[PDB]
Write a protein that binds this ligand. Structure first.
Ligand SMILES: [Ca+2]
Length: 422
């Protein structure tokens, strides 16, 4: 004769206080109700029939969201309901992120979907985030956030890390100019740029970034940085380390340590080849450039039990280096491959990338690996309020015509929705 008094799980609020998930006895059982339907459910996760969090934040914070049931046996013990959680997510921005990512995947023929995220580079709070395919009502693979749990060869979006390391080590600056050949031998393979020249070009570090020269990056790493300082910087930037994001399934990635480097490793990694990491690591690294040199922890939960949590930060580069990098990322958007990411009335510092799909458990790939088109940008970098990432997986269209285009529209909407006026 032991009756269960079912506790209710804690409520999940978005940043404006909208209820995203709440438990109800209309189930005797309890069930979650998601008022905005499928919007943000990928982040929220689902709760199964045993009322256990099964994916997303429901799972990640299940021990605090789940209460403790009561029991009626002449003896009664109280149900303790779970603790409420407030997230950084702006539900209306989440809806746009989802619809824009879905439309982009369709328009640019991204055969393996993509991801999108808007975050505050100073506090680390995530305003919106999504991966395609998205779930509804259910395919278990759509419950992951690809940004966190899938790994890719990052490609050219990584060049901001390589230049930051050099600059922060005082080995060159934006205007430093070098005679860059058409190709360079790295290990036993040649590095080349897809371009017009048939001769070496004198290019400043700023220019190598503007045009995204792989050859220039490999030159910088091999002739100026050196593998040791390179590998130390990668490590300081958190590359190959989990970011600490509060979401399940975070991949650490596959990144060679210095003692495992071989002939071509450093040169290739300089332009984002020879490692495979989740894009959340790239995003996290960019926060250092956007936040005066301090890298933050991307995250969803702002408060639990009315207790605001402190999230770890790390000083990676100086503010001067961060400023020189932002200056160059601004050239990318004003004068280079990122020009379609520009947004009328705002300053956008960013970088395009062409990355690759990889064998998930090894980080390598063959001839038919699909390309990943990415764009990562910071809006009004002096305000420290917004950075957005857009990635399209297995598309044939260049990041300059695809991911950068999606960013201009979504980052604009993120900026209107938030404080950001210009
Ligand atoms: Ca590029």
């Amino acid at each position: 004769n032991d009756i269960v008094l079912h506790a209710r799980r804690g409520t999940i609020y978005d940043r404006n206080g909208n209820v995203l998930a709440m438990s109800v006895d209309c189930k005797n059982n309890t069930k979650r109700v998601y008022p905005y339907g499928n919007v943000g459910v990928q982040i929220l996760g689902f709760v199964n029939a045993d009322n256990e969090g099964a994916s997303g934040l429901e799972y990640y914070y299940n021990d605090i969201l789940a209460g403790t049931n009561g029991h009626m046996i002449s003896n009664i013990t109280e149900a303790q309901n779970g603790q409420d959680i407030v997230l950084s997510i702006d539900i209306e921005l989440q809806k746009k992120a989802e619809e824009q990512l879905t439309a982009a995947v369709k328009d640019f023929e991204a055969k393996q979907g993509g991801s999108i995220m808007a975050m505050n580079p100073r506090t680390g709070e995530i305003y919106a985030a999504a991966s395609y395919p998205l779930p509804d009502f259910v395919d278990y693979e759509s419950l992951n956030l690809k940004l966190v749990s899938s790994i890719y060869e990052p490609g050219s979006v990584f060049k901001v890390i390589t230049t930051s390391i050099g600059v922060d080590n005082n080995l060159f600056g934006p205007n430093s100019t070098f005679n860059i050949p058409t190709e360079l031998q790295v290990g036993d393979n040649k590095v080349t740029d897809d371009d017009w020249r048939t001769s070496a070009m004198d290019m400043s570090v700023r220019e190598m970034l503007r045009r995204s020269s792989n050859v220039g990056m490999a030159f910088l790493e091999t002739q100026l940085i050196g593998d040791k300082r390179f590998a130390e910087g990668i490590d300081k930037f958190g590359i190959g380390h989990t970011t600490g994001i509060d979401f399940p399934g975070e991949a650490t990635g596959i990144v060679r340590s210095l003692d495992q480097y071989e002939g071509p490793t450093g040169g290739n990694m300089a332009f984002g080849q020879g490692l495979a990491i989740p894009f959340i690591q790239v995003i996290r690294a960019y926060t250092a450039v956007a936040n005066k040199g301090t890298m933050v922890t991307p995250h969803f939960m702002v408060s639990k039990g009315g207790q605001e949590v402190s999230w770890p930060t790390k000083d990676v580069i100086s503010s001067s280096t961060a400023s020189a990098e932002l200056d160059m990322m601004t050239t990318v958007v004003k004068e280079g491959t990122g020009v379609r990411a520009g947004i009328y009335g705002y300053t956008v510092a960013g970088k395009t990338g062409t990355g690759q799909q990889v064998v998930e458990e090894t980080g390598s790939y063959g001839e038919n690996s699909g390309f990943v088109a990415s764009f990562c940008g910071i809006v009004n970098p002096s305000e420290s309020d917004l950075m957005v990432y857009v990635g399209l997986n297995d598309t044939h269209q260049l990041a300059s015509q695809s991911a950068a285009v999606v960013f201009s529209q979504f980052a604009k909407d993120a900026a209107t929705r938030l404080n950001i006026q210009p």
